[PDB]
Short mmCIF file of C-alpha atoms in Angstrom, two decimals:
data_model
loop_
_atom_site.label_atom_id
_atom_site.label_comp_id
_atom_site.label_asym_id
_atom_site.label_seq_id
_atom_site.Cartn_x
_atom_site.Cartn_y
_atom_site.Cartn_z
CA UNK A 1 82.57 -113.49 231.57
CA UNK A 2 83.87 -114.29 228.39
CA UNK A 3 86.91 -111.81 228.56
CA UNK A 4 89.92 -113.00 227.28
CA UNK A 5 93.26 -111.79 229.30
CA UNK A 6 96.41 -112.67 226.78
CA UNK A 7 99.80 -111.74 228.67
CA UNK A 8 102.49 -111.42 226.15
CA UNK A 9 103.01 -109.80 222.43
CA UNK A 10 103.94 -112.96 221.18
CA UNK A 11 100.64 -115.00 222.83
CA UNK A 12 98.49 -111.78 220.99
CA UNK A 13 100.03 -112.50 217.67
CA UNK A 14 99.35 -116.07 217.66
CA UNK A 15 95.79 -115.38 219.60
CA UNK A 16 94.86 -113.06 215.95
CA UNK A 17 96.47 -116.28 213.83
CA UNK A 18 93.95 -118.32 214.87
CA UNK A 19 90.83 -115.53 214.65
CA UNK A 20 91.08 -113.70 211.23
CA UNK A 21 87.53 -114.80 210.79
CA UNK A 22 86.29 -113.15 214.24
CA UNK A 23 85.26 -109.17 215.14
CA UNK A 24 87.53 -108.57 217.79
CA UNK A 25 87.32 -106.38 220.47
CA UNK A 26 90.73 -105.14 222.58
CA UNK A 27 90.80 -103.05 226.16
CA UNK A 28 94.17 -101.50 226.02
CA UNK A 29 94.55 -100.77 229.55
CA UNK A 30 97.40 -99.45 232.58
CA UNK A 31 97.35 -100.84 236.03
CA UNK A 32 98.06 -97.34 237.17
CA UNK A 33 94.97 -96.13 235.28
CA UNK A 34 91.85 -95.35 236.94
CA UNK A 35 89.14 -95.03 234.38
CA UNK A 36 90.29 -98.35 233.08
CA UNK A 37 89.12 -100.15 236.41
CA UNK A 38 85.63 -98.33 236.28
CA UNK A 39 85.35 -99.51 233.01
CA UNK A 40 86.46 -102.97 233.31
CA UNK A 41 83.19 -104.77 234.74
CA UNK A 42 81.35 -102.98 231.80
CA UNK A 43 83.52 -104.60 229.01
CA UNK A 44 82.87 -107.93 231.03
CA UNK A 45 79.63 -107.61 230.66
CA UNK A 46 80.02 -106.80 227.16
CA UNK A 47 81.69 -109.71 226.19
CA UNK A 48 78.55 -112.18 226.90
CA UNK A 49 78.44 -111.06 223.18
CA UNK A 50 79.09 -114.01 221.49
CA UNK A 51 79.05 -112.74 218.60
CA UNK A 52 82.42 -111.18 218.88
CA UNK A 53 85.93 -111.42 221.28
CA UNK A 54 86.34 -109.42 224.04
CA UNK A 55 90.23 -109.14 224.90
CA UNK A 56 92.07 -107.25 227.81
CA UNK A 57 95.66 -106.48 227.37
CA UNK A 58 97.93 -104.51 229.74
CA UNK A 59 100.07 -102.15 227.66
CA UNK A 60 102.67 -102.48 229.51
CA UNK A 61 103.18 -106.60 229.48
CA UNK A 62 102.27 -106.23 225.25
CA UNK A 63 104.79 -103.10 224.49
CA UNK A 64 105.30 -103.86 220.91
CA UNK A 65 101.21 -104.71 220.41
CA UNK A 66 100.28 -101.17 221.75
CA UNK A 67 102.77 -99.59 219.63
CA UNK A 68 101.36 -101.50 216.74
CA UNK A 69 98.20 -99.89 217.10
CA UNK A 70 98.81 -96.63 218.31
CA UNK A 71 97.75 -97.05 222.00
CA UNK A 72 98.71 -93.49 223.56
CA UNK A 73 95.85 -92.48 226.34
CA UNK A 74 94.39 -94.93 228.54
CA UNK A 75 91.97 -97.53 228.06
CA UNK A 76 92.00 -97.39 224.27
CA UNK A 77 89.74 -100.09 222.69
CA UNK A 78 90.42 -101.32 219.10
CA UNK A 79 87.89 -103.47 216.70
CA UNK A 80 89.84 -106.04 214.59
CA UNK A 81 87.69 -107.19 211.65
CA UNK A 82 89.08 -109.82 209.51
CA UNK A 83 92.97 -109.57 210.97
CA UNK A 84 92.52 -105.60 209.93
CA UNK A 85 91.90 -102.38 212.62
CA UNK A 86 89.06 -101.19 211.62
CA UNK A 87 88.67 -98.82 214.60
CA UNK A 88 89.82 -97.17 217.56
CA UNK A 89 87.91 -95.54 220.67
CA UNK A 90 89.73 -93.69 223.46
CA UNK A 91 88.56 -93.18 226.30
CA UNK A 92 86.25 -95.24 228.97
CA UNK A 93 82.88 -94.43 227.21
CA UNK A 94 80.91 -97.38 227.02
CA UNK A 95 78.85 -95.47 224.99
CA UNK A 96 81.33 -94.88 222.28
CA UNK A 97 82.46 -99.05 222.04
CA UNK A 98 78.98 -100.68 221.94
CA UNK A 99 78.71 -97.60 218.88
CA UNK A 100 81.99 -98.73 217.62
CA UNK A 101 81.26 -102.71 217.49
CA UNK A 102 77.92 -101.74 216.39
CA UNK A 103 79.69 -100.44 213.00
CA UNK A 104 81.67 -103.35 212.47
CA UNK A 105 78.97 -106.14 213.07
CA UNK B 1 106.63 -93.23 220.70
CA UNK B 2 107.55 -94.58 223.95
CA UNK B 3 105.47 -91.09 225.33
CA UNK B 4 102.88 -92.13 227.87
CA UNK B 5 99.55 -89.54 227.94
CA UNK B 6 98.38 -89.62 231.52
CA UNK B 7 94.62 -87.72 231.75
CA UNK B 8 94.29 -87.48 235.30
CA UNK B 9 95.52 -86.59 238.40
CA UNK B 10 94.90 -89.85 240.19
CA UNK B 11 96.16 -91.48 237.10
CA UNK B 12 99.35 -89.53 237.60
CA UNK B 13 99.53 -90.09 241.29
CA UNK B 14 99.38 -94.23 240.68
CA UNK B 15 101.67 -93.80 237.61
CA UNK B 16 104.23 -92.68 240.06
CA UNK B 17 103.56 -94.75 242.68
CA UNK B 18 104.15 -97.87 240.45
CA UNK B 19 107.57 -96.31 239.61
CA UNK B 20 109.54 -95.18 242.25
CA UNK B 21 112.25 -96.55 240.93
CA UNK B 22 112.75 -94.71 237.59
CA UNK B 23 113.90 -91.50 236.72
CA UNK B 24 110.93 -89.63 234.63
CA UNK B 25 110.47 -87.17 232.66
CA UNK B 26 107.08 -85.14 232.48
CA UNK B 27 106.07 -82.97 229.37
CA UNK B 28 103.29 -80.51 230.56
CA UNK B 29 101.49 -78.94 227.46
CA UNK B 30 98.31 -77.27 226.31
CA UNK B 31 95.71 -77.87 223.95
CA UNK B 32 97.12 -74.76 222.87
CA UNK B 33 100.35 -74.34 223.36
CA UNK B 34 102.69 -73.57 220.15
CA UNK B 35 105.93 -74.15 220.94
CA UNK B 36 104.45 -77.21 222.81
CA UNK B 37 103.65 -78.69 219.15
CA UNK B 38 106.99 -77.67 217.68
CA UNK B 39 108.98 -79.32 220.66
CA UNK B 40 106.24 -82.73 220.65
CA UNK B 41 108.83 -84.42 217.61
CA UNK B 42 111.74 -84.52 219.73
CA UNK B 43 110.08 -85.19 222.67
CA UNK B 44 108.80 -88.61 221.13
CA UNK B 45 112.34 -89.04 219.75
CA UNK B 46 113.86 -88.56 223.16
CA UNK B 47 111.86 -91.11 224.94
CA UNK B 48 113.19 -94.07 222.65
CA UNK B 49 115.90 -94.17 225.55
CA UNK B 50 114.24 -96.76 227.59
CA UNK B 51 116.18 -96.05 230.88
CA UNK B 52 113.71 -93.31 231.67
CA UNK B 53 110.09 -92.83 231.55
CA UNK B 54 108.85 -89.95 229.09
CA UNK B 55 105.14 -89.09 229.74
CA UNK B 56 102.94 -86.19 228.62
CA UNK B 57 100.31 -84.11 230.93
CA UNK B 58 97.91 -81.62 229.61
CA UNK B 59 98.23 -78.70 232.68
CA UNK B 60 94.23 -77.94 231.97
CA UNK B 61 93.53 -81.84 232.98
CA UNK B 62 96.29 -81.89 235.78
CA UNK B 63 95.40 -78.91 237.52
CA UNK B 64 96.72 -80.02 241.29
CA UNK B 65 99.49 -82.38 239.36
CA UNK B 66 101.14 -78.67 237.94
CA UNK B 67 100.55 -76.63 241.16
CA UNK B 68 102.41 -79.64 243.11
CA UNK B 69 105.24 -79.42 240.97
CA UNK B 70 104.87 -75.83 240.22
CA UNK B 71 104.19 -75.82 236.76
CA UNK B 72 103.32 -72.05 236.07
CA UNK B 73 104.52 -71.76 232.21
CA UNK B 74 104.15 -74.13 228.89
CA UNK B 75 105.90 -75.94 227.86
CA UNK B 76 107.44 -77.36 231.40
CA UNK B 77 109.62 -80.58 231.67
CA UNK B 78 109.74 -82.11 235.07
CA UNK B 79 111.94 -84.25 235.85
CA UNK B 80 111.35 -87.09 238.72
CA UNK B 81 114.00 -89.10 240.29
CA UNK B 82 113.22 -91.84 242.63
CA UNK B 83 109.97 -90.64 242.73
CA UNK B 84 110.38 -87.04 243.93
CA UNK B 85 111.30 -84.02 241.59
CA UNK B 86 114.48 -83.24 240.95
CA UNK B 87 114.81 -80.43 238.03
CA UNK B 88 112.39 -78.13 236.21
CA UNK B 89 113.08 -77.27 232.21
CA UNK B 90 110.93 -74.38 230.96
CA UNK B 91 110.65 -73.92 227.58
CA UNK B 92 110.92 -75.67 223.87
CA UNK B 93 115.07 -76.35 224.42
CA UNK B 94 115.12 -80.74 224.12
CA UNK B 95 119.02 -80.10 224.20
CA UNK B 96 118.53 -78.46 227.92
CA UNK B 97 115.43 -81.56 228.50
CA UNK B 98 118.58 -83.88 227.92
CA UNK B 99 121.22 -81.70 229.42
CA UNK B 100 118.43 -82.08 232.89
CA UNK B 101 118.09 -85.79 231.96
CA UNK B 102 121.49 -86.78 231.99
CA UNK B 103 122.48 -85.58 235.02
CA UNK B 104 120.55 -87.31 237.51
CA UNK B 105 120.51 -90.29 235.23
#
């Protein structure tokens, strides 16, 4: 896989330093939350996209980086398009993030 | 916010599990419920004490969640200590969420 797992706020802020030219693509996720596993070998597969990054980060190791965007209900996924949130899906749909990276391409 | 949403019952179950060790507090609302909404603000203002966990359930997606802690009226706060409940507010008063808080803090 091509998943990217980034374990602190301050390893995410330099990780989108050095990729404000890049669609990203961010699994907020709990280890308590269910829907999140079942979800998780999807957005591995996913991520064989090269054409964008696929990150994982556990809201709870990245407090101040799920406050920044919002994160509320878990997984949330947010697209990053040029340094900039360009969009938000909640929920595990697969469905609704290939739509949602679709946009941003 | 520092308000977690937690969707489902499982969800909730693990959520607890992973925090045995912290007093919580559980908002149970519905889609619906007006004097949910008004009480919402200070709930979210409440939870900036980190000490405790804050989290919101919706009692139509928590069905067996609110019979096991006998949730029978919106808006309820439950309050878990040590992982078992400990007090039950009922109703939009944050002053009485806080006075329930406090003491088993």
């Amino acid at each position: 896989s091509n998943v990217l797992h980034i374990e602190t706020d301050d390893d995410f802020d330099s990780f989108l330093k050095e990729n404000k030219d890049k669609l990203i693509v961010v699994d907020f996720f709990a280890t308590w939350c269910g829907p999140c596993k079942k979800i998780a070998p999807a957005f591995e597969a996913l991520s064989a996209d090269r054409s964008a990054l696929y990150v994982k980060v556990d809201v709870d190791k990245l407090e101040e980086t799920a406050r920044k965007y919002d994160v509320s209900a878990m997984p949330t996924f947010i697209v990053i398009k040029n340094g900039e949130k360009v969009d938000t899906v909640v929920g595990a749909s697969i469905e609704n993030v290939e739509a949602a990276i679709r946009k941003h391409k």
